[PDB]
Amino acid sequence: HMAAEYAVVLKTLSNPFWVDMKKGIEDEAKTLGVSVDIFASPSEGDFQSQLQLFEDLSNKKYKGIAFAPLSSVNLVMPVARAWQKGLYLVNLDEKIDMDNLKKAGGNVEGFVTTDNVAVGAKGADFIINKLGAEGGEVAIIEGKAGNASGEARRNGATEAFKKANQIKLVASQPADWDRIKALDVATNVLQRNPNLKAFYCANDTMAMGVAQAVANAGKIGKVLVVGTDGIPEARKMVEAGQMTATVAQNPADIGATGLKLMVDAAKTGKVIPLEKTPEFKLVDSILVTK
Template structure:
């Protein structure tokens, strides 16, 4: 009789373990990025997929063709909502373009996590929606770090320019404001231009060229991402000037440019870690565990 009880208990434990394992295998999340045309988002995709593999779950990553395709990203989210995912992580192109679909996800009881690019919290709340967590870099601090670096390279000050991302974009605006506010604390600096280039390399090349033509004594350019910074580097080469260029993100090509003595520095984010953290956070939410709402992933300066 005792042997039978032991056997029954053992079979129950095996059955329970198999059930838990099956449930873990059944977890399926979606991650909606901006575009995989930018190495920043490719790195984040890798973080999502590799952490999913480690956790024994599925994460399907989606992105649109370019960072300007606002409506396409909204339609992508609409499609994702029809596929019964257990959780969704998203990085909106603008602070408001995905609010309607976040609200629909809430109505379906799907945990939603905002990653890197921030949704407008007030507008979301006004629409009746919410996110469970915001995983991000402190973009304002990134701009400040860039300004500190420029000031360290130009002790006598000088004219500087900012190449912004897309107009109205939360992360780009925060980086711009961080740089502008911090450089103003150093004597002798003047921000002579602050213009968007839509995260685009060619547009940034044009903006940098135009700014340098108007200000022959320009000393530095801060760019809100590395793709634009690489365009600015090319513009500096084209005119043969000694202008400091600082980027943001720490993508491989930018790091190589820094090592080659072309770009002066980049403030590196860690998109891979953001993807990893998003997967871990969604798993906790599905399990009913508490998570921090505001999760900061550190950045670092990479300089020549």
């Protein structure tokens, strides 16, 4: 076909989060009356694949590109070149390394994301509110060490628990984004803590394992299980009373907000100055309960 006015580079289209963001962008494009070409990294996970696609798009006729980079650094150079060429650029989801982008002589109009610290605090706060005055014992099932998202969720939840005197955080252990490792880690926490009242789980893949461990221990309704992401299976488990809750992301609105921010910057007919702090838009997470 003939190229749209705008392009979007997503990380992947391999799961509902990214399909939902693509749907969000299309729905917003129709409302705004603009055309958008939406792409994923042509080879899943492939940093160079995504760099090559971004370069190909910034060599075409696009007014702007919104991008969710595979890593903080992988798109720094072609994003810096696209800014220098005068394209209106919006960073979605994963924050590009802005030190490196400025060092390369680039900038972006804006960054649209979910605050993973507030996500973990929202999951903890739900538990604190459910346990009320008496509080009690809670545990965190962490992601893989050194994951910035995972660490942000752990920090948010841990900080929220620390501020409730009636809460005791008895265990905080990694299950490295793995369902069966989470099943095993949660089984062991339950065995060590017969009075546990809740788990916060840094993602739903792990949360669904924790749900199985609570079910096996005969603790449905006695040990709360809170996930993160709002993936379809987790929502089914919430509906069925097998998980208590999941803190859902809103990829549709990260996408819609990102496109709107790009179109609004384009309408000024000047890209953001090198020196200027980009726009910063947070999309709230949604607590999903029965």
